[PDB]
Each structure stands twice: as structure tokens, then as C-alpha cells.
Design a protein around this ligand. Sequence first.
Ligand code: CA
Ligand code: CA
Length: 498
Amino acid sequence: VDWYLVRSLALNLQDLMMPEQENFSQYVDCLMAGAFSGYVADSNLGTGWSGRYATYNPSDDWKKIPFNDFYSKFYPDYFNLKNQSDDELFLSLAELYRIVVMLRVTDTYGPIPYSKVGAANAIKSPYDSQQAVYAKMLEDLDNIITVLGKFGNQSFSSSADRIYNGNTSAWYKFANSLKLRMAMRTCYVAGFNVNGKTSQQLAEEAVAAGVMTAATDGAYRKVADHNPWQRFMVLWSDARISADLTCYMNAYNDPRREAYYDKSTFGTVSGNAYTGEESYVGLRRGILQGQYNSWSQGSSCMKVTTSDNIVVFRASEVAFLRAEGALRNWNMGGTAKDFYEEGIRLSFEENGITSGVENYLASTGKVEAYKDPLKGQSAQTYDYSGAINTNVTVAWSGGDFEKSLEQIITQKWIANFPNGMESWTEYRRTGYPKLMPMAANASGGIVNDAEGARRMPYPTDEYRENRESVEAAVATLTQESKTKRGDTMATHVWWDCK
Ligand SMILES: [Ca+2]
Ligand SMILES: [Ca+2]
């Protein structure tokens, strides 16, 4: 057995949960998920991009990357590892990475090639319904949890794991935390069960077995070369913090502002022509390419270095998932209020904030209108001011289900930055947090402004290379949906049925 190759393959599979490769990450995590989650505002002042995901008009090349590139990058190594190793622990971890990676893909598209992927050309296969994908994943995850449990306090080679350094018990907590994330995801699907286990049952089992409970249980990958966000934000200035994120965090006087990003640098960018003040202020999402104010890169920028860890799965997310389950009257091991406050405390700890959580927890600050700081400035033609329509605040009020769910999800959304893939999925599922619509909707009427993008359409090339399977997939997508809008960004995937 060639351990050197097996370690190498395991490492590449692990990476694809939250990819490091800057030219892959930029599309899937920054340009796509970052826009749709409400976290990132594209700030490229060039004419080279014909359109973007944010304005609902990406090019055919951009539409190929979040589908095809996951299959090209994941499956050759996955099939190779299965031929190179018979070790139950390494095969269970390889399957766990497959579930997390393909969870992003089914949450982007709906039906996808999964159970019938060929070793020759993985994507050139029949598509499973999203329900069949979730059912197979949840069933395989139960077996992975059993395998990780029996290894208990045994450790594997730290060189094959840049997240938990071979600590199997940390992977056990991650796997049960994923099980709770997927159980909560399917909570609106009437009669959903996996071998008789309902969403409630899967969630209760995960919590009883052992999920992440401490900030140090969180999954953070030590970069192999550099954190790609340093490129997107600092070096290239292709991305800025969204106006939505600074609207909520300013209203709550959030001390995580200093942990996440910096104050604006309009004076620098303007050559001191800027007459306003510097503050925590993001850029409007969905500004049409070619319609930016020239001082737009003066907007708040992420605080990030090349050596910063990649955020894979935060422990604070698990506490907010338990808060939601407790709100749904599931046995989560405590009240909705206790897990809500625990999620906020865990997020403060994750961001190195040692004081002021008790004052933050009592905060009743209300979200105000977004005032574009460049409005009326020299040679700054555009005004991207707008308003988030919400009364959500921090101080736990209890009572009304929807108002409590909005608190839980809004606080999960602040804590889960910069994990846009997860936050876009949670925005679609619950409707929270309330976000501003895109400044420019270039979908031609396909995408509704209040709903935003609900999915990505299948790449046009897949209709030409795999027509029968893709046409059957669009038929499956329609049959599982409760908002049938064809193979477009407007169609709701199977779990998106609130
Ligand atoms: Ca069965
Ligand atoms: Ca804590």
C-alpha cells in the first residue's frame, strides 16, 4: 500500500469542502455564494466581465465552473483512493468529504449525478433526485458516524488531515454536526424520512451521539499555500464587504466588525477628494458591471492574510441549529434561548472577543436604511442607497415562531461569515436574514427581486454531451419542486419548500 499517494488523495478531497485554489474559490465561494448569501459585493471596475452571478447574467463559462469543476476535481482522486486503500477509516473520511462537497452541488442545482457516477466521466451519468441524494448521503453518514465512533480516541496520520490533525473524535463530532445540518435542511419537506427516520429523529440522534459544542471543535483548514480571500479582497480588490452585513452589524454595534473587516478607505482611493467620514460600510451587491462609482473599492474590506485558515464548519452554526431544533420542539438538550445565546458566545470566542457578550445579548438596536457613502461625492454619479425591511434585533424575545426563527438565522448568518455557500442555502430555506435586492437585475425577468437566485441552471454543454440524462433531470427538478420555473435560477430545489 502506497501511504504517500493515499495521504495525498485524502488531502485533495478534504480541500474541496471549501476550496483553496484561488481560480476555483473565486467563482464558487466569492462570486457566486458570496453574492447570493448577502456577504460579498463584487467591486471590479473593469469592462472584462460581460456579466456576473450577482446580477443574474453570468457567462456560459461562469455557469460551467460550479457544476463541472467539482466533478473534475473530486471524482478522479475519490475513485483512485478507493482502488489504493482498504482502510475503513480512510474510506469513511473520503465518503464524508464526498457528502460535504456534493451537498454544496445538490444545494446549488437540485437533481445531480450522485449514486450512478461512472469512474470514466463522473458528470456524464444519470441524475438522482435531490431527495434520493439526501437519503443516500444521510444513510451513508450514519455508517461513517458508526466507523468514526469505534475508532474512538485513536488518531490517524496528522499529515493526511489539515483540519483536525488526525483526531478521529473531532471528525465524529463533525459528522454528527453535518447530520444535524442536513436534518434541519429537510424540515419543510412533508413526510420526509430515511429508513423510517424523520428530520426530527435524525436531528435528535445527531445531538444525542455528539455534535460540536466548543469553539475548538470547529473545522478550520490550515492552508497549503494561501487563503484565497486575501487575493479577492486585499490584493485584487475584486470583492468588498456587502452593504447588508455592515447594516446589521452597525445596528447591533457588533464587536465582530473589527474581527471581520476594516473601516472604509475612501480618502485613500479618492486622493483625499472624499468629503465624508470613514466607517464600517459595505458596497451594494448587484451593481451592474460598468456602473460602479470610481471610489467603490474604498468600501470596507475583509481583514485577511494569506496564512489565515479556511472556515469549513463553525461550532457556533451547530448551537444555532440546536436553537432552531429546540424552537421546532425537538429534543436538542436545552431551550431555544439557551442555544441562541450559546451560538453568539461561541461566535465571539471564535473571533477572539473576550469582553462585551452580555451587553451584546441585551442589545435592541434596529437596522437602519443603507445610505450610499459615495452619494453626491465628486465624479461619483451613482446612488446605491436602499433599505433592509426588518425589525430583528439581538435581545431574545421568544414567543412568535417566525420572529424567533428570524433571530436565530440572522445571528447564525453573522456568525457564519465568510461561509456564503451555507448562508445562501439557509437564506433560501428560511427567508432569513432579510437582504436588499440586487441593485441591477439583469435576468430579463427570470429572477424575482424578493426571492433572488434559488438555484443555478444546468450548464448548456451538459445538454449537448448528456441530453437524455439532463432532460430527465429537469423533469425530476420540476416534479420535486413546489415553485416550478424550468431549468432556471427561479426554480426551487426539493428542500426549498417553506
Ligand atoms: Ca431502506
Ligand atoms: Ca462559549
